[PDB]
């Protein structure tokens, strides 16, 4: 698929609440870090014998992930996410398709 780098959509910043220009970043997982309740609460259960308790994951089937667009306004720069349907090949690149000029080779 393909998506525009720039998009004019609705922006609620309490200072505008009107359509503005948006630069489109792509969403990013991020480091799981530490200290999160799900970490302390976990490793406290991992220590000592008995080993693995919190169930491991195996059966993965789905090959795709909904691509999340991280939007930025150019005035108040709020960040409001947006979702797209599942796609295997993503790009934010430009060079919009032509009229159907002859397929090369």
């Amino acid at each position: 698929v393909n998506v525009p780098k720039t998009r004019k959509t609705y922006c609620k910043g309490k200072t505008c609440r009107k359509h503005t220009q948006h630069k489109v970043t792509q969403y990013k997982a991020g480091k799981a870090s530490l200290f999160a309740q799900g970490k302390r609460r976990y490793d406290r259960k991992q220590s000592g014998f008995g080993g693995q308790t919190k169930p491991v994951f195996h059966k993965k089937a789905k090959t795709t992930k909904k691509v999340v667009l991280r939007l930025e306004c150019v005035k108040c720069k709020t960040r409001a996410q947006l979702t797209l349907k599942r796609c295997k090949h993503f790009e934010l690149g430009g060079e919009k398709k032509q009229k159907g000029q002859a397929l090369q080779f």
Binding site: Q26, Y27, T63, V67, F90
Partner: protein, 154 residues
């Protein structure tokens, strides 16, 4: 006004698993967390009330070593994804090769082949004549696979 553009990448994708009874000769399988192509395929009963296993033997695409596995056939062996880039080969510079996509000519990379077949290519380059050399990107591993050359194009 704002900058640095934070250019990143593309999202999604994967290597789709399948039922392990559909695999075939020159099918593509991940054993050892490594890609492979099947050569020897075998199925069997266990004993009386058999839940049938399958013992594949697969020779690597990239490394080349001969690998084996045995599993019951329902549970999945996750399959890598394969594509040819059909690159055209210009001069081979240093240890890398230099490949030209029709659309763009960037990306010399691809290490040049370890392949003994890449030696005939190494040999036949100075003779020339449109070097059209496919490679495969499967699981981000890319190395030269086959040499090919057109006969005309002028």
């Amino acid at each position: 006004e704002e900058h640095t553009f934070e250019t990143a990448d593309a999202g999604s994708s994967a290597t789709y698993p399948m039922q392990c009874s559909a695999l075939r000769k020159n099918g593509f399988v991940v054993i050892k967390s490594r890609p492979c192509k099947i050569v020897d395929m075998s199925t069997s009963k266990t004993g009386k009330h058999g839940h049938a296993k399958v013992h594949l033997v697969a020779i690597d695409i990239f490394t080349g070593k001969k690998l084996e596995d045995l599993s019951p056939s329902t549970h999945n062996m996750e399959v890598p994804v394969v594509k040819r880039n059909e690159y055209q080969l210009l001069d081979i510079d240093d240890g890398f090769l230099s490949l030209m996509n029709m659309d763009g000519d960037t990306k010399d990379d691809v290490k040049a082949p370890e392949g003994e077949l890449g030696d005939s290519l190494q040999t036949a380059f100075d003779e020339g004549k449109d070097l059209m050399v496919t490679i495969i990107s499967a699981m981000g591993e890319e190395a030269a696979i086959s040499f090919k050359e057109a006969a005309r194009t002028d």
